[PDB]
């Protein structure tokens, strides 16, 4: 069959992955492409040309993530963090996490994959202490999957409302959900007559 | 009393620790750390696609180093070894010792793709060619620090008698053309912790920086923290240094109105509209051996009432006017010196046209949030001075809709008579 | 396929057969370009350096030639040698 | 001296909390887990803490008795932080340790040894049936009937002979219903 | 469900990716024949990405 | 002088101006395995390129022979040869028989230009002056020894080249005697391939603390045999540690915290990672100072302890678990009464790197754990390619272990490596008590028939260990002169000694007006002019020379022949 049955239902890892990267990011650029007034040319297809015939060295600029990350593999150019990826803005966010702990906190729908990618392959721009930062992002995690948690004890067939869960943890947690919630409605309208 | 000491731009001291940053730009930076004795000069390019990072050994300890695209300045100022490694590596590091009387000591070294400049303590500027023949030897009010961007070098001429003053001048490989002469520098000398004195004992003048603009116009940060562009530069009877950014309010501002120490920009070039300087969030201004990632920041006219933003928040808060009015006086000024450089030497981006049609009309909509402000004080006679100044004639239909929208039919007609003036 | 006979019943055995027939048929054709045998993971290194975990003499390449040699490594583009890969020759 | 013992569960709490290799809080992950099977109970490799700081380890080794149970309450401060949502219970937690060093041959056991955290192996030749362990305590005083209770350790106490609010030698006693308990068994090792 | 095929979409981009490898080659039969060779990996990349996308889709479907 | 160090940046710039193509790859690297040294420049450019993005090749060899099989079967796309470690002596041009016209392609003007490119990084000392000089296809990193030892050698070979009669003899023969003289003279690596490739990759700008790592591993490695190479270019190494170091002092330890520091790196086995008592048990210079061999040694190695004040029992325990107070005082007690024993040479300043919480290492430690990966890390012609195919699969294992990442492998080197130790001092041990060294007054001939580690001793790494450790007893035995070193081991599976000629050396510690000239090795030369001489089977194929293989039965007549032998 045309699709493993480990993708039937859901997205590995790697899919996340790949949709994160179709993401744009500040960079900086160590190279200038940009050709003075006074060659090869990208001409990509699926993401903006324009910027990357237009490099200058130390200029910030924003491009899709995947090709942040070919260059970053070389010397040639630097990830700028995201400002939500600061120990201020985390610690801001867990202190909201410890205030509303019905409610789960607003960060970047791609937070998790995201820091992780950077971790791996931008340590050096980051900053802040990394290691603080891992130690940081952690925590989150740790209260988001306890707060998972107490949701997931009142599992109703009605409905649902994640609000600003994240889309790795909505991927994690996708088939253990939607399985009972399925089995629940199953159960509910074979009462119904 | 005041001490000359050796500088280059955006240099930093040793301090407790045994490496420095002989200095810093756009270009690159060059950090020398002692070793045994024997110091060890690293060059590092920004741009790893123009050139090649290179280290070397130096045993005569060059303090002064001058940075750029042709190659690097290295030189002592107590011993008066003067070094010249081309880039290229085509041609040999050329090398020389200037004379150097007693006390007479080199205060910075400037470097010209065609020419070399020297500096001393006694004010005996030097002249040598790319491959170190000398051209010729002036007595000057001493310099402090010697940038040099393309063909065009700019000097801060400093004395205890003839005070602060800067030369600006665009030696070029002919034509040499002196803009200005030791004219006043109207720059604020620090006042007289620790480290802020230790960096003062490494740069007596307290000059954060000095370099010129991405376009070239030339550009200096004192200890005052404010950079400061010279408006008008080429012609000097309009020549006029305009505070572009007051960094210590920027960010007293993005910090939230919170008043921060630790933050400390270190300028390092100023790209157009934005300055490329490493925010130094430590007890040393300077920065580390691991250097970070440089930071951006939009220039700013400083027109912001400190006591107004408080009162505002009691994530700052700007009133739409107070805030327009900035945004109308950058866009004028940045217009000012596109234009003029546009004109004086055309462009090296195509896009500078477009962006100065852009600028033109941001201030126009400027001027319109501004009438809009006016009108609503129904100061019809300060809103038709507003759109007096305006440029577009397509924003003064914008601008009379407004003044109908405000219900000033005074006004309207006046700037009916004002789209009347302009089709004349 | 697209990249224990006995076990099958011939009706199976002439089944998958066909299947087979059917999958080449829609590969070739429209959306030819993309290889719908392909792997599904997503291509995410441009670039893998790799061990031929056995040797079988040098193969082609649209450019170039592979030289299979037992403990060699190779530093190549991850789509060219994808199919060498899960044919078992390559190592990582 | 209780500031020096809650130093010391601090500098425990840092190393749960913080010992991290590659990319992972293999202590933290572990604590969590267990946590959520129930199992109230870590194990720490010794090389692992010794990397954090030679001198938790050191002092663990001079004072073990003492050392491991502070240890133990780290643990639990560490278990309720990462599993119980503060501003928003759990049991004492068992801390299990592996040296992996040189061994000590069971003959060779002597004074030299007493108190020292010891390694080694042998065949274990037979097993009791487990006992009761009063983790906690509940107490009433017999005369003036002043509430009280205990919580002791499996390590290196008495009901206490004084009334803190004469009442009597030992007016204390054991209130079985409210105390807690664990179990205890006792191996032979030849 | 299976959704609508939106034939427009693939339509257009399967001409693209034709177009984009064939001027692909191109540039690889200019350098057999700067010569910076870094927009050529990313788009040998961005073709790599999008016919996986475009498989994942028709294998699902 | 064919390539000097100024130029390796340009012939860098010329191998990616013909092999650059993302299309193919066109550069292949030969590798000589059994060199640690040879196997840390090898990754080091495999890094380089990888920034570089150029496609390539790895081909790990054993042999000349296989080489020149290799060779054989290339292709011409690939027009850039890297050889590490291997080819430097040799004619490879003649070995290869490799055609300038075959290869010759563009040549014009007065210009040269071939197909292929054969770049050496082979720096033995000996180099073939044809290859220097007579060749072109080849290329040669050199150190500049030509250019600085053999501008008369490169006069007479020029002279030689031009001759094409009272004066022709009266200039021939001086030009043939120069280059004779400047042959006939033993092998001895000048510099570590390691320190040469860091050069170029300063000179691209490319260093950063891994590549200096590597390139202190490689020269640690080299340091046993050349330990007068290592002392001249330690400085350097220092210098550049010092250049990379961080401006950060003190930072609090953290698991991203990686540091290289400079510290005392007492010279013996396996310290961090076995006990102090097993280290200095296994220290080669720790035996061959107190003769540890005979029991004697060990008691006044437990005298030595006692001296100490540290407790035996102690210095038994696991290193990682010594008690802090020992683990920190340790450099005074070093600093006390090592000289009372004749020690205090083992008190040596190395790098030691370190990461993380995970522990720490030295470079000793870690290159000895890296050889032993490399030795251990798992029809008679099969056979022997059965077990050169081990020996290069135990090559690659070290190319994974050179990795961070593969601390588990690292670990189980470092295993390995202490039981190859032991096994070694054990044997060691045996043969001197059996006294099975014989002063023939050529050599002290050695021969092994004993069936236990006769297996082991089969890798050609393992022998030298033990002839290493044979050689470090016999140099510090001052009644013992420095005689020539055989040894040979037969193989039952294929009936043949695993003759080694290694070369004697003057104390570790000895440093006067001696010591300073550096004891060639003509064992090589003699076993192959006893070879062209004789016709017993031998194997010269193995790239180190100075071993070889012989027949069970052909080893007792190329003795004979080896002491009738001039040579030596
Ligand atoms: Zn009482």
Same mark, same amino acid.
């Given at each position: 069959? /045309?699709?493993?049955?480990?993708?039937?239902?859901?997205?590995?890892?790697?899919?996340?992955?790949?949709?994160?990267?179709?993401?744009?990011?500040?960079?900086?650029?160590?190279?200038?492409?940009?050709?003075?007034?006074?060659?090869? =040319?990208?001409?990509?297809?699926?993401?903006?040309?324009?910027?990357?015939?237009?490099?200058?060295?130390?200029?910030?600029?924003?491009?899709?993530?995947?090709?942040?990350?070919?260059?970053?593999?070389?010397?040639?150019?630097?990830?700028?963090?995201?400002?939500?990826?600061?120990?201020?803005? @985390?610690?801001?966010?867990?202190?909201?996490?410890?205030?509303?702990?019905?409610?789960? &906190?607003?960060?970047?729908?791609?937070?998790?994959?995201?820091?992780?990618?950077? !971790?791996?392959?931008?340590?050096?721009?980051?900053?802040?202490?990394?290691?603080?930062?891992?130690?940081?992002?952690?925590?989150?995690?740790?209260?988001?999957?306890?707060?998972?948690?107490?949701?997931?004890?009142?599992?109703?067939?009605?409905? @649902?409302?994640?609000?600003?869960?994240?889309?790795?943890?909505?991927?994690?947690?996708?088939?253990?959900?939607?399985?009972?919630?399925?089995?629940?409605?199953?159960?509910?309208?074979? *009462?119904?007559? | 009393?005041?001490?000359?000491?050796?500088?280059?731009?955006?240099?930093?001291?040793?301090?407790?620790?045994?490496?420095?940053?002989?200095?810093?730009?756009?270009?690159?930076?060059?950090?020398?750390?002692?070793?045994?004795?024997? $110091?060890?000069?690293?060059?590092?390019?920004?741009?790893?696609?123009? !050139?090649?990072?290179?280290?070397?050994?130096? +045993?005569?300890?060059?303090?002064?180093?001058?940075?750029?695209?042709?190659?690097?300045?290295?030189?002592?100022?107590?011993?008066?070894?003067?070094?010249?490694?081309?880039?290229?590596?085509?041609?040999?590091?050329?090398?020389?010792?200037?004379?150097?009387?007693?006390?007479?000591?080199?205060?910075?070294?400037?470097?010209?793709?065609?020419?070399?400049?020297?500096?001393?303590?006694?004010?005996?500027?030097?002249?040598?060619?790319?491959?170190?023949?000398?051209?010729?030897?002036?007595?000057?009010?001493?310099?402090?620090?010697?940038?040099?961007?393309?063909?065009?070098? !700019?000097?801060?001429?400093?004395?205890?008698?003839?005070?602060?003053?800067?030369?600006?001048? #665009?030696?070029?490989?002919?034509?040499?053309?002196?803009?200005?002469?030791?004219?006043?520098?109207?720059?604020?000398?620090?006042?007289?912790?620790?480290?802020?004195?230790?960096?003062?004992?490494?740069?007596?003048?307290?000059?954060?920086?000095?370099?010129?603009?991405?376009?070239?116009?030339?550009?200096?940060?004192?200890?005052?923290?404010?950079?400061?562009?010279?408006?008008?530069?080429?012609?000097?009877?309009?020549?006029?240094?305009?505070?572009?950014?007051?960094?210590?309010?920027?960010?007293?501002?993005?910090?939230?109105?919170?008043?921060?120490?630790?933050?400390?920009?270190?300028?390092?070039?100023?790209?157009?509209?934005?300055?490329?300087?490493?925010?130094?969030?430590?007890?040393?201004?300077?920065?580390?051996?691991?250097?970070?990632?440089?930071?951006?920041?939009?220039?700013?006219?400083?027109?912001?009432?400190?006591?107004?933003?408080? #009162?505002?928040?009691?994530?700052?808060?700007?009133?739409?006017?107070?805030?327009?009015?900035?945004? $109308?006086?950058?866009?004028?000024?940045?217009?000012?010196?596109?234009?003029?450089?546009?004109?004086?030497?055309?462009?090296?981006?195509?896009?500078?046209?477009?962006?100065?049609?852009?600028?033109?009309?941001?201030?126009?909509?400027?001027?319109?949030?501004?009438?809009?402000?006016?009108?609503?004080?129904?100061?019809?006679?300060?809103?038709?001075?507003?759109?007096?100044?305006?440029?577009?004639?397509?924003?003064?239909?914008?601008?009379?809709?407004?003044?109908?929208?405000?219900? +000033?039919? /005074?006004?309207?007609?006046?700037?009916?008579?004002?789209?009347?003036?302009?089709?004349? | 396929?697209?990249?224990?006979?006995?076990?099958?019943?011939?009706?199976?055995?002439?089944?998958?057969?066909? $299947?087979?027939?059917?999958?080449?048929?829609?590969?070739?054709?429209?959306?030819?370009?993309?290889?719908?045998?392909?792997?599904?993971?997503?291509?995410?290194?441009?670039?893998?350096?790799?061990?031929?975990?056995?040797?079988?003499?040098?193969?082609?390449?649209?450019?170039?030639?592979?030289?299979?040699?037992?403990?060699?490594?190779?530093?190549?583009?991850?789509?060219?040698?994808?199919?060498?890969?899960?044919?078992?020759?390559?190592?990582? | 001296?209780?500031?020096?013992?809650?130093?010391?569960?601090?500098?425990?709490?840092?190393?749960?909390?913080?010992?991290?290799?590659?990319?992972?809080?293999?202590?933290?992950?572990?604590?969590?887990?267990?946590?959520?099977?129930?199992?109230?109970?870590?194990?720490?490799?010794?090389?692992?803490?010794?990397?954090?700081?030679?001198?938790?380890?050191?002092?663990?080794?001079?004072?073990?008795?003492?050392?491991?149970?502070?240890?133990?309450?780290?643990?639990?401060?560490?278990?309720?932080?990462?599993?119980?949502?503060?501003?928003?219970?759990?049991?004492?937690?068992?801390?299990?340790?592996?040296?992996?060093?040189?061994?000590?041959?069971?003959?060779?056991?002597?004074?030299?040894?007493?108190?020292?955290?010891?390694?080694?192996?042998?065949?274990?030749? &037979?097993?009791?049936?487990?006992?009761?362990?009063?983790?906690?305590?509940?107490?009433?005083? %017999?005369?003036?009937?002043?509430?009280?209770?205990?919580?002791?350790?499996?390590?290196?106490?008495?009901?206490? %002979?004084?009334?803190?609010?004469?009442?009597?030698?030992?007016?204390?006693?054991?209130?079985?219903? *409210? *105390?807690?308990?664990?179990?205890?068994?006792?191996?032979?090792?030849? | 469900?299976?959704?609508?095929?939106?034939?427009?979409?693939?339509?257009?981009?399967?001409?693209?990716?034709?177009?984009?490898?064939?001027?692909?080659?191109?540039?690889?039969?200019?350098?057999?024949?700067?010569?910076?060779?870094?927009?050529?990996?990313?788009?040998?990349?961005?073709?790599?990405?999008?016919?996986?996308?475009?498989?994942?889709?028709?294998?699902?479907? | 002088?064919?390539?000097?160090?100024?130029?390796?940046?340009?012939?860098?710039?010329?191998?990616?101006?013909? /092999?650059?193509?993302?299309?193919?790859?066109?550069?292949?690297?030969?590798?000589?395995?059994?060199?640690?040294?040879?196997?840390?420049?090898?990754?080091?450019?495999?890094?380089?390129?990888?920034?570089?993005?150029?496609?390539?090749?790895?081909?790990?060899?054993?042999?000349?022979?296989?080489?020149? =099989?290799?060779?054989?079967?290339?292709?011409?796309?690939?027009?850039?040869?890297?050889?590490?470690?291997?080819?430097?002596?040799?004619?490879?041009?003649?070995?290869?028989?490799?055609?300038?016209?075959?290869?010759?392609?563009?040549?014009?003007?007065?210009?040269?230009?071939?197909?292929?490119?054969?770049?050496?990084?082979?720096?033995?000392?000996?180099?073939?002056?044809?290859?220097?000089?007579?060749?072109?296809?080849?290329?040669?990193?050199?150190?500049?020894?030509?250019?600085?030892?053999?501008?008369?050698?490169?006069?007479?070979?020029?002279?030689?080249?031009?001759?094409?009669?009272?004066?022709?003899?009266?200039?021939?023969?001086?030009?043939?005697?120069?280059?004779?003289?400047?042959?006939?003279?033993?092998?001895?690596?000048?510099?570590?391939?390691?320190?040469?490739?860091?050069?170029?990759?300063?000179?691209?700008?490319?260093?950063?603390?891994?590549?200096?790592?590597?390139?202190?591993?490689?020269?640690?490695?080299?340091?046993?045999?050349?330990?007068?190479?290592?002392?001249?270019?330690?400085?350097?190494?220092?210098?550049?540690?010092?250049?990379?170091?961080?401006?950060?002092?003190?930072?609090?330890?953290?698991?991203?915290?990686?540091?290289?520091?400079?510290?005392?790196?007492?010279?013996?086995?396996?310290?961090?990672?076995?006990?102090?008592?097993?280290?200095?048990?296994?220290?080669?210079?720790?035996?061959?100072?107190?003769?540890?061999?005979?029991?004697?040694?060990?008691?006044?190695?437990?005298?030595?302890?006692?001296?100490?004040?540290?407790?035996?029992?102690?210095?038994?325990?696991?290193?990682?678990?010594?008690?802090?107070?020992?683990?920190?005082?340790?450099?005074?007690?070093?600093?006390?009464?090592?000289?009372?024993?004749?020690?205090?040479?083992?008190?040596?300043?190395?790098?030691?790197?370190?990461?993380?919480?995970?522990?720490?290492?030295?470079?000793?430690?870690?290159?000895?754990?890296?050889?032993?990966?490399?030795?251990?890390?798992?029809?008679?012609?099969?056979?022997?390619?059965?077990?050169?195919?081990?020996?290069?699969?135990?090559?690659?294992?070290?190319?994974?272990?050179?990795?961070?990442?593969?601390?588990?492998?690292?670990?189980?080197?470092?295993?390995?490596?202490?039981?190859?130790?032991?096994?070694?001092?054990?044997?060691?041990?045996?043969?001197?008590?059996?006294?099975?060294?014989?002063?023939?007054?050529?050599?002290?001939?050695?021969?092994?028939?004993?069936?236990?580690?006769?297996?082991?001793?089969?890798?050609?790494?393992?022998?030298?260990?033990?002839?290493?450790?044979?050689?470090?007893?016999?140099?510090?035995?001052?009644?013992?002169?420095?005689?020539?070193?055989? +040894?040979?081991?037969?193989?039952?599976?294929?009936?043949?000694?695993?003759?080694?000629?290694?070369?004697?050396?003057?104390?570790?510690?000895?440093?006067?007006?001696?010591?300073?000239?550096?004891?060639?090795?003509?064992?090589?030369?003699?076993?192959?002019?006893?070879?062209?001489?004789?016709?017993?089977?031998?194997?010269?194929?193995?790239?180190?020379?100075?071993?070889?293989?012989?027949?069970?039965?052909? @080893?007792?007549?190329?003795?004979?022949?080896?002491?009738?032998?001039?040579?030596?």
């Amino acid at each position: 069959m /045309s699709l493993p049955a480990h993708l039937q239902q859901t997205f590995s890892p790697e899919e996340i992955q790949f949709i994160v990267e179709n993401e744009p990011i500040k960079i900086f650029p160590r190279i200038t492409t940009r050709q003075k007034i006074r060659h090869t =040319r990208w001409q990509l297809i699926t993401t903006d040309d324009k910027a990357l015939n237009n490099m200058v060295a130390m200029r910030s600029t924003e491009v899709v993530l995947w090709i942040a990350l070919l260059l970053k593999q070389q010397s040639k150019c630097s990830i700028v963090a995201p400002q939500w990826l600061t120990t201020k803005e @985390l610690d801001r966010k867990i202190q909201y996490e410890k205030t509303h702990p019905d409610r789960f &906190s607003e960060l970047p729908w791609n937070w998790l994959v995201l820091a992780r990618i950077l !971790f791996n392959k931008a340590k050096d721009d980051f900053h802040d202490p990394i290691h603080e930062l891992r130690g940081k992002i952690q925590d989150l995690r740790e209260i988001r999957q306890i707060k998972v948690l107490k949701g997931l004890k009142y599992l109703n067939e009605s409905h @649902l409302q994640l609000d600003n869960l994240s889309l790795l943890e909505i991927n994690e947690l996708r088939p253990f959900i939607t399985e009972i919630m399925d089995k629940l409605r199953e159960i509910h309208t074979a *009462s119904l007559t | 009393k005041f001490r000359y000491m050796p500088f280059s731009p955006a240099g930093t001291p040793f301090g407790f620790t045994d490496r420095r940053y002989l200095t810093m730009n756009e270009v690159g930076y060059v950090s020398t750390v002692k070793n045994s004795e024997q $110091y060890s000069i690293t060059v590092s390019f920004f741009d790893v696609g123009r !050139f090649r990072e290179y280290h070397f050994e130096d +045993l005569f300890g060059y303090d002064l180093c001058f940075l750029n695209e042709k190659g690097t300045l290295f030189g002592q100022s107590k011993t008066g070894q003067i070094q010249y490694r081309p880039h290229d590596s085509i041609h040999s590091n050329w090398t020389k010792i200037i004379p150097l009387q007693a006390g007479e000591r080199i205060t910075s070294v400037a470097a010209t793709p065609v020419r070399v400049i020297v500096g001393t303590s006694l004010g005996y500027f030097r002249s040598f060619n790319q491959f170190g023949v000398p051209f010729a030897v002036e007595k000057t009010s001493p310099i402090v620090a010697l940038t040099a961007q393309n063909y065009r070098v !700019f000097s801060v001429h400093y004395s205890q008698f003839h005070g602060l003053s800067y030369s600006l001048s #665009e030696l070029g490989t002919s034509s040499k053309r002196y803009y200005k002469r030791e004219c006043p520098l109207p720059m604020s000398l620090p006042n007289i912790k620790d480290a802020n004195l230790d960096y003062y004992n490494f740069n007596p003048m307290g000059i954060k920086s000095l370099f010129f603009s991405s376009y070239g116009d030339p550009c200096i940060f004192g200890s005052d923290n404010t950079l400061l562009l010279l408006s008008k530069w080429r012609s000097p009877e309009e020549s006029k240094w305009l505070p572009i950014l007051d960094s210590n309010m920027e960010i007293w501002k993005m910090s939230g109105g919170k008043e921060t120490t630790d933050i400390h920009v270190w300028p390092l070039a100023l790209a157009y509209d934005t300055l490329n300087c490493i925010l130094v969030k430590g007890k040393h201004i300077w920065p580390e051996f691991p250097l970070p990632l440089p930071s951006e920041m939009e220039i700013r006219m400083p027109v912001f009432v400190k006591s107004k933003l408080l #009162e505002e928040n009691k994530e700052i808060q700007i009133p739409v006017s107070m805030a327009a009015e900035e945004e $109308y006086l950058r866009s004028k000024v940045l217009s000012e010196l596109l234009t003029d450089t546009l004109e004086n030497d055309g462009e090296m981006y195509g896009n500078e046209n477009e962006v100065l049609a852009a600028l033109n009309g941001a201030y126009d909509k400027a001027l319109l949030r501004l009438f809009a402000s006016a009108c609503s004080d129904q100061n019809v006679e300060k809103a038709l001075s507003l759109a007096h100044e305006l440029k577009q004639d397509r924003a003064l239909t914008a601008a009379v809709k407004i003044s109908e929208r405000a219900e +000033l039919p /005074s006004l309207v007609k006046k700037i009916n008579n004002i789209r009347e003036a302009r089709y004349e | 396929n697209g990249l224990d006979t006995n076990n099958l019943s011939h009706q199976e055995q002439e089944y998958l057969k066909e $299947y087979c027939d059917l999958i080449t048929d829609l590969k070739s054709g429209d959306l030819v370009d993309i290889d719908l045998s392909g792997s599904l993971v997503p291509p995410s290194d441009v670039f893998i350096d790799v061990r031929v975990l056995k040797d079988a003499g040098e193969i082609q390449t649209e450019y170039g030639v592979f030289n299979l040699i037992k403990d060699s490594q190779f530093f190549v583009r991850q789509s060219d040698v994808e199919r060498l890969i899960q044919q078992g020759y390559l190592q990582k | 001296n209780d500031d020096d013992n809650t130093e010391i569960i601090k500098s425990f709490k840092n190393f749960i909390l913080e010992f991290r290799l590659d990319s992972q809080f293999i202590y933290r992950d572990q604590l969590r887990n267990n946590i959520l099977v129930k199992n109230y109970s870590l194990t720490v490799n010794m090389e692992h803490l010794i990397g954090y700081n030679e001198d938790i380890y050191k002092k663990l080794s001079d004072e073990p008795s003492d050392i491991i149970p502070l240890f133990e309450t780290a643990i639990t401060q560490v278990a309720k932080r990462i599993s119980i949502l503060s501003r928003a219970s759990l049991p004492t937690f068992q801390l299990i340790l592996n040296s992996n060093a040189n061994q000590i041959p069971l003959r060779d056991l002597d004074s030299e040894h007493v108190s020292k955290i010891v390694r080694l192996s042998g065949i274990i030749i &037979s097993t009791s049936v487990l006992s009761s362990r009063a983790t906690y305590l509940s107490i009433m005083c %017999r005369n003036c009937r002043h509430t009280t209770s205990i919580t002791i350790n499996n390590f290196n106490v008495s009901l206490p %002979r004084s009334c803190l609010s004469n009442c009597g030698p030992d007016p204390y006693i054991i209130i079985h219903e *409210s *105390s807690k308990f664990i179990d205890q068994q006792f191996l032979k090792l030849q | 469900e299976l959704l609508p095929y939106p034939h427009q979409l693939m339509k257009r981009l399967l001409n693209r990716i034709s177009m984009q490898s064939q001027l692909i080659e191109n540039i690889s039969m200019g350098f057999l024949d700067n010569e910076s060779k870094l927009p050529l990996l990313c788009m040998e990349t961005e073709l790599e990405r999008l016919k996986f996308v475009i498989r994942s889709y028709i294998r699902c479907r | 002088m064919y390539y000097g160090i100024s130029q390796f940046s340009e012939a860098y710039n010329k191998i990616l101006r013909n /092999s650059s193509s993302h299309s193919s790859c066109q550069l292949v690297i030969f590798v000589s395995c059994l060199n640690i040294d040879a196997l840390c420049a090898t990754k080091m450019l495999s890094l380089l390129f990888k920034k570089q993005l150029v496609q390539s090749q790895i081909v790990p060899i054993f042999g000349y022979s296989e080489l020149r =099989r290799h060779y054989s079967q290339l292709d011409d796309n690939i027009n850039s040869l890297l050889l590490v470690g291997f080819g430097g002596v040799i004619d490879l041009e003649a070995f290869l028989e490799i055609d300038p016209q075959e290869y010759v392609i563009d040549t014009d003007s007065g210009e040269q230009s071939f197909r292929r490119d054969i770049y050496v990084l082979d720096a033995h000392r000996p180099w073939n002056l044809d290859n220097i000089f007579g060749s072109q296809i080849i290329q040669c990193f050199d150190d500049g020894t030509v250019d600085d030892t053999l501008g008369e050698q490169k006069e007479a070979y020029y002279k030689l080249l031009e001759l094409d009669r009272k004066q022709r003899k009266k200039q021939i023969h001086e030009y043939e005697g120069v280059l004779e003289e400047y042959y006939s003279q033993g092998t001895t690596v000048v510099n570590s391939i390691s320190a040469q490739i860091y050069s170029l990759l300063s000179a691209i700008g490319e260093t950063n603390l891994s590549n200096l790592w590597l390139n202190i591993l490689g020269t640690t490695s080299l340091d046993i045999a050349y330990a007068q190479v290592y002392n001249r270019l330690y400085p350097l190494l220092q210098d550049e540690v010092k250049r990379l170091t961080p401006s950060s002092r003190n930072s609090v330890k953290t698991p991203d915290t990686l540091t290289l520091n400079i510290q005392p790196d007492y010279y013996l086995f396996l310290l961090r990672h076995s006990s102090l008592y097993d280290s200095f048990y296994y220290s080669n210079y720790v035996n061959a100072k107190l003769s540890l061999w005979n029991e004697n040694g060990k008691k006044r190695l437990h005298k030595m302890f006692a001296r100490m004040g540290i407790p035996l029992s102690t210095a038994q325990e696991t290193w990682l678990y010594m008690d802090h107070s020992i683990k920190r005082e340790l450099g005074i007690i070093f600093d006390k009464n090592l000289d009372r024993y004749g020690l205090q040479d083992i008190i040596r300043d190395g790098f030691v790197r370190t990461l993380g919480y995970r522990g720490s290492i030295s470079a000793s430690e870690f290159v000895e754990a890296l050889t032993a990966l490399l030795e251990v890390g798992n029809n008679s012609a099969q056979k022997l390619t059965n077990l050169r195919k081990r020996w290069v699969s135990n090559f690659w294992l070290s190319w994974d272990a050179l990795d961070d990442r593969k601390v588990e492998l690292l670990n189980r080197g470092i295993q390995l490596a202490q039981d190859l130790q032991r096994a070694i001092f054990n044997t060691g041990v045996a043969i001197l008590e059996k006294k099975l060294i014989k002063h023939l007054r050529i050599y002290r001939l050695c021969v092994l028939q004993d069936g236990p580690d006769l297996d082991l001793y089969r890798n050609p790494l393992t022998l030298l260990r033990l002839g290493n450790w044979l050689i470090e007893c016999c140099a510090e035995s001052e009644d013992k002169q420095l005689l020539p070193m055989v +040894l040979a081991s037969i193989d039952e599976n294929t009936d043949t000694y695993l003759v080694a000629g290694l070369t004697p050396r003057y104390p570790r510690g000895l440093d006067t007006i001696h010591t300073k000239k550096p004891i060639l090795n003509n064992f090589s030369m003699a076993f192959q002019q006893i070879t062209a001489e004789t016709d017993a089977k031998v194997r010269i194929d193995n790239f180190e020379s100075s071993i070889i293989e012989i027949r069970r039965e052909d @080893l007792s007549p190329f003795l004979e022949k080896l002491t009738l032998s001039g040579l030596l």
